[PDB]
């Protein structure tokens, strides 16, 4: 018990040695007014707006940097610590430009409040204010930096979370301006977080410039579907259209940060969006028609076609509830050709034991690892808020990162073992140098990005990695609950698909062409009318008209994750629930119901008729979909290896390369993104 | 006196709520999350019970947002999971409790950034 | 068409409204009236812009006409100032 005892205005709390004075007040429950101190950012002491008075002490101390000592009673509401705030707030406000009705961080200001609660009723600054020169930091951040309180949060985030040290302070005195010395845009993922982290409205979001004002925004808590980290987010909706998506904190998944894609592609959600159910008509043009007519177009073809003549290529952002409603339907006409666009090697236990296909070590385990051998992925642009995880654990802890992929910008110092899938065999043999490095690791982890598995020798690549994980585990003698093998995805509806029993890859549809295909939100080119039977009856089930719509005999519009109470699951199997922020547009309907209804018109009606019932259905297919925010550990790995050992495959010499080589690759990757005007502006800025 | 009864005190029939707004409607007990835009933690301390989001459409004449969900602007505020589950069960609504998410303790030190 | 679009598409049934009636539309677009104004030349690096008034104009903000490259524009009046 190394607790040390310290008094918060008397509550006499006991705290670990090394907790800051500000932290001591927090556990009692008091809040020190603070600027320039963020929990996951280094203490800087720039503002000194947190001056408090420990007891019988000569001067005020900075609650952000003073380690509380033994038996110091903090007096947070003394007559002194209020003159130490009534007089600081005098200064921050003195050089501040009064354009609060321009500053769109109007009600979202941590500087008006603290002025309005702890600061002063009046002003004594009868002199002249200063002005700085607005510069361009990008097409996402509007830096009206005459607002800046030189709190250096931005500089730190830019250097400690995102590894992009482009921002910095220049000059001394009252014209220290915290902007890039040369005008180089702040181009990085994790970029938009600066907005959320600058308490002042100096730099704010340019798309959401002046569309709203925070008191009005109704805030619904939901889940990120753009990437497979499944970052928690809050969708701010006003009068029924989404106005902004900002992060909400999840310790394990996104701890207060969200990607540039899943914050500025809410605009893409509002155009090129399907709404009414069109049906090919006349010469072939698609013609808007009522559900009844469009549904029976599909139902009639479904009754005519038998099993293995009906197939589904789902993929992208479809929810688990639709995925079970599409499987239950196509099995009621006996085709189990349901498939996903992202090919996960099934030449093994395959989709059968989750240990196989789930980051086993959780995102939060990256903090406890000792060496990570990333093979096949550019975590940065595939799963950015997991790249950050390895960013923090390489800085605050000591992770030794090794990449077997293309040498790529990783925001940290990795070891480039090489660009060849066969050198995986080199480490398994113990031939390559890093073989000992791992031998030295007590808690190692290996990450294989699905983006590799998508090549032709992906089955061989998974088997080769499983062999190395096997002897890495044997040589290290790592404990059982520590799990070395994990694989990260880049498609939101993959893990759930795989769990619900959907077989990955369109390989099965390729060998026998289905008379009728019900593409379920699939905008990928995995099959085309060109590769289908002459009949080629195909019906798109989705939200945005992109690739599957113009080659579709029927259009059954659906919703998006802002518009339905569906479930998703990220890579380590944590199921999460999207909440309806806005009602779905036009005649468009929830994905699960379209398929329950088509089944009623077809006559093979599905059992559930309300969503709680579909949640009960999910419980039957895979039981850890009905369970939210819980990661389950049963590492059925040992048996996975046995089947891997049976599988014999050749890893071709072609280097394994992540598709998202540089950030322009990243911006536009999905229907809701490829339709983004903001993403498009970002794409041309890079090009 | 002191009669004994064994119900979950369903006052669903004393409340006066039209059936369809007591049957097909899910309350979501949760402690509101912080506005990333600010760092004040005073709006993440009391458990709220908000209802499902139904249609918010457009008034043809002026373009305003219109609605038919009488229980749309409803955000009852409780002080503990226990007291929110009780009210929902009391009124006959379906609930989706979400556990609180207090930040864990993260150790912060000024000197640390000076090491080399 | 209003300064902010709004023009109804010919097919829009929302056009009956104006039958035997008309459409309230302001002819004085502020996008152009403000452009029909002389860039306020100044000597000082920074200048104020009370909105041409004290308490009868807009909150007073100081604009940095520091780069001839850009004429500072008070976010309230849209007045460009030429260093």
């Amino acid at each position: 018990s190394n607790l040390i005892e310290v008094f918060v205005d008397g509550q006499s709390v006991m705290v670990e040695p090394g907790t800051t004075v500000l932290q001591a007040c927090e556990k009692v429950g008091m809040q020190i007014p603070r600027f320039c101190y963020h929990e996951r950012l280094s203490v800087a002491g720039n503002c000194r707006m947190c001056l408090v008075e420990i007891e019988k002490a000569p001067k005020v101390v900075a609650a952000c940097a003073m380690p509380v000592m033994k038996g110091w009673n903090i007096l947070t509401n003394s007559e002194k610590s209020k003159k130490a705030r009534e007089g600081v707030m005098e200064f921050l406000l003195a050089n501040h430009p009064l354009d609060c009705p321009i500053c769109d961080q109007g009600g979202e200001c941590d500087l008006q409040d603290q002025s309005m609660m702890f600061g002063s009723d009046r002003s004594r600054f009868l002199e002249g204010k200063r002005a700085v020169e607005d510069k361009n930091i990008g097409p996402l951040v509007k830096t009206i930096m005459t607002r800046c309180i030189q709190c250096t949060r931005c500089i730190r985030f830019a250097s400690e979370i995102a590894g992009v040290d482009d921002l910095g302070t220049t000059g001394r005195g009252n014209d220290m301006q915290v902007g890039t010395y040369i005008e180089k845009m702040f181009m990085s993922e994790l970029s938009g977080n600066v907005i959320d982290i600058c308490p002042v409205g100096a730099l704010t979001s340019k798309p959401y410039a002046f569309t709203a004002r925070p008191w009005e925004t109704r805030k619904t808590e939901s889940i990120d579907v753009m990437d497979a980290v499944g970052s928690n987010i809050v969708v701010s909706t006003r009068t029924g259209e989404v106005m902004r998506i900002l992060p909400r904190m999840h310790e394990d998944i996104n701890e207060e940060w969200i990607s540039d894609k899943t914050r500025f592609a809410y605009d893409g959600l509002k155009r090129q969006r399907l709404t009414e159910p069109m049906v090919r008509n006349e010469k072939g043009l698609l013609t808007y028609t009522s559900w009844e007519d469009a549904l029976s177009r599909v139902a009639g073809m479904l009754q005519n076609f038998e099993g293995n003549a009906v197939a589904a290529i789902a993929g992208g952002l479809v929810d688990a509830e639709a995925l079970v409603a599409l499987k239950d339907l196509l099995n009621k006409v006996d085709s189990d050709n349901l498939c996903t666009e992202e090919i996960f090697p099934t030449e093994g236990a395959g989709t059968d034991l989750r240990s196989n296909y789930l980051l086993n070590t959780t995102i939060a385990g990256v903090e406890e690892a000792d060496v990570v051998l990333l093979v096949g992925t550019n975590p940065r642009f595939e799963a950015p808020l997991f790249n950050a995880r390895i960013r923090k654990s390489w800085l605050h802890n000591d992770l030794k990162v090794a990449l077997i992929g293309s040498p790529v910008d990783l925001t940290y110092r990795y070891d480039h073992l090489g660009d060849s899938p066969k050198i995986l065999q080199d480490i398994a043999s113990g031939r390559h140098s890093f073989c000992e490095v791992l031998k030295d690791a007590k808690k190692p982890m290996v990450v294989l990005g699905s983006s590799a598995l998508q090549r032709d020798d992906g089955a061989a690549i998974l088997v080769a990695v499983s062999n190395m994980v096997q002897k890495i585990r044997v040589t290290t003698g790592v404990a059982a609950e520590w799990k070395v093998m994990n694989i990260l995805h880049r498609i939101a509806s993959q893990v759930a698909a795989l769990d619900l029993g959907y077989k990955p890859g369109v390989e099965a549809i390729r060998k026998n062409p289905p008379k009728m295909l019900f593409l379920l939100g699939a905008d990928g080119g995995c099959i085309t009318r060109q590769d289908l039977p002459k009949d080629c009856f195909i019906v798109y089930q989705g939200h945005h008209g992109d690739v599957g719509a113009p080659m579709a005999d029927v259009i059954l519009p659906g919703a998006a994750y802002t518009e339905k109470s569906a479930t998703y699951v990220n890579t380590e199997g944590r199921a999460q629930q999207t909440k309806v922020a806005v009602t779905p547009p036009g005649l468009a309907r929830e994905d699960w119901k379209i398929i329950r209804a088509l089944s009623e018109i077809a006559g093979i009606t599905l059992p559930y008729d309300t969503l709680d019932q579909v949640r009960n259905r999910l419980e039957e297919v895979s039981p850890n979909l009905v369970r939210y925010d819980d990661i389950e550990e049963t590492n059925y790995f040992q048996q996975a290896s046995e089947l891997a050992k049976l599988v014999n495959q050749e890893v071709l010499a072609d280097p394994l390369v992540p598709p998202q080589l540089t950030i322009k690759d990243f911006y536009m990757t999905d229907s809701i993104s490829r339709a983004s005007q903001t993403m498009a502006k970002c794409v041309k800025a890079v090009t | 006196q002191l009669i004994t009864v064994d119900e979950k005190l369903d006052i669903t029939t004393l409340t006066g709520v039209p059936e369809e707004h007591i049957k097909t409607r899910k309350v979501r007990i949760f402690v509101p999350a912080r506005n990333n835009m600010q760092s004040g933690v005073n709006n993440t301390k009391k458990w709220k019970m908000e209802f499902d989001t139904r249609e918010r459409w457009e008034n043809p004449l002026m373009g305003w947002a219109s609605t038919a969900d009488p229980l749309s602007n409803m955000v009852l505020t409780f002080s503990a999971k226990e007291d929110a589950i009780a009210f929902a069960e009391k009124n006959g609504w379906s609930y989706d409790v979400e556990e609180k998410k207090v930040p864990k303790p993260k150790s912060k030190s000024y000197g640390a950034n000076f090491s080399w | 068409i209003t300064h902010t679009g709004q023009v109804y598409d010919e097919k829009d049934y929302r056009r009956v409204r104006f039958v035997d009636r008309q459409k309230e539309v302001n002819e004085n677009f502020a996008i152009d009236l403000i452009a029909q104004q002389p860039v306020n030349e100044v000597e000082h690096r920074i200048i104020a812009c009370d909105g041409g008034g004290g308490a009868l104009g807009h909150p007073k903000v100081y604009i940095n006409l520091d780069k001839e490259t850009k004429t500072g524009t008070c976010g309230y009046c849209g007045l460009q100032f030429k260093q």
Binding site: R271, L285, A549 | - | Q6, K23
Partner: peptide, 27 residues
């Protein structure tokens, strides 16, 4: 120091949504 000019309201909003326009020629 009966009239036709009657105020009529709008939705001065720029329509806030965009539907996919179906492909012009068949496949």
């Amino acid at each position: 120091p009966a009239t036709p000019e009657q105020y009529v309201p709008y939705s001065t909003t720029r329509k806030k949504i965009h539907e996919w326009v179906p492909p012009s020629t068949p496949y």
